[PDB]
UniProtKB/Swiss-Prot annotation:
Observed in all cell lines analyzed. Expressed in a variety of lymphoid and non-lymphoid cell lines. The chain holds residues 577 to 870 of 1187 of the full protein. Belongs to the protein kinase superfamily. Tyr protein kinase family. JAK subfamily. It comes from Homo sapiens (Human). This is Non-receptor tyrosine-protein kinase TYK2. Phosphorylated. Tyrosine kinase of the non-receptor type involved in numerous cytokines and interferons signaling, which regulates cell growth, development, cell migration, innate and adaptive immunity. Plays both structural and catalytic roles in numerous interleukins and interferons (IFN-alpha/beta) signaling. Associates with heterodimeric cytokine receptor complexes and activates STAT family members including STAT1, STAT3, STAT4 or STAT6. The modification Phosphotyrosine is found at residue 28.
Length: 261
């Protein structure tokens, strides 16, 4: 093993406006010259394992292609700062967009988005690679598709700092997207995240257990409580099965989403 990713020189990037924060990151709009519109993910000063995890994600995402996976252009080191350089996708995070468009996103639109997500994720399953952070915030909207005769187009972004390097406190915050087996490893975890993401999508960007304290989210998992029903219901319940070996394959998930729309 030896990572593979493009090294970007600090001269080749321009840092523009702050977009928000990811896990141990600050995220900015930028420009990449040899000019590409890009996103810059500046890793906070942090333990070395966080840094290694960041690089492991850049390497992973630098070696996969898909219609519905966002590009990773490289990594730029700017003195003590490590910066992942990624695709700017026009309309930003899906969760933010859904909350703003709450009430007038039709179920048929959500079905297309779901089918796109599933096919991205079936490709990673085929490659036996784990994403580890499927949630609406990591789904970026390239086309709105709300206009008559158009259809939406999403891209799944990089998972950022790997799950294994995060604190237990951080993993709790990711409930219900976090697979229960990860609270105390496989491609199975993304079936849970997918399920949790489908609920998030069905509820116009509100995910379940958002009004719950960390202790309550933990307790929900400990008592293996069942998450609400969106009929994507069968599918979502299948994905949101605590036992990883009972979650259906993306081949099945995708075949099912097709013969639904
Ligand atoms: N590749 C990638 O992740 N692109 C991202 S991340 C992001 C973002 C992240 C955290 C808070 C708010 C926005 C926006 C965009 C974008 N518009 O493409």
């Amino acid at each position: 093993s030896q990572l593979s990713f493009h090294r970007v020189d600090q001269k080749e990037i321009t840092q523009l406006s702050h977009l928000g924060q990811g896990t141990r990151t600050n995220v900015y709009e930028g420009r990449l010259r040899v000019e590409l519109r890009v996103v810059l993910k500046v890793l906070d000063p942090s333990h070395h394992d966080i840094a290694l995890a960041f690089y492991e994600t850049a390497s992973l995402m630098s070696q996969v292609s898909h219609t519905h996976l966002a590009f990773v252009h490289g990594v730029c080191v700017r003195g003590p700062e490590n910066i992942m350089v990624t695709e700017y996708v026009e309309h930003g995070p899906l969760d933010v967009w859904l909350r703003r468009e709450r009430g007038h996103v039709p179920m048929a639109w959500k079905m297309v988005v779901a089918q796109q997500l599933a096919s991205a994720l079936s490709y990673l399953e085929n490659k036996n690679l784990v994403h580890g952070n499927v949630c609406g915030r990591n789904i970026l909207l390239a086309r709105l598709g709300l206009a008559e005769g158009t259809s939406p187009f999403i891209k799944l972004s990089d998972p950022g700092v790997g799950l294994g390097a995060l604190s237990r406190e951080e993993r709790v915050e990711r409930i219900p997207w976090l697979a229960p087996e990860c609270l105390p490893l496989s491609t199975a975890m993304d079936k849970w995240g997918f399920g949790a993401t489908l609920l998030e999508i069905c509820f116009d960007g509100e995910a379940p257990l958002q009004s719950r304290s960390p202790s309550e989210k933990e307790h929900f998992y400990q008592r293996q409580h069942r998450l609400p029903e969106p009929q994507l219901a069968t599918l979502t319940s299948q994905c949101l099965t605590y036992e990883p070996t009972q979650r259906p394959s993306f081949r099945t998930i995708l075949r099912d989403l097709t013969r639904l729309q």
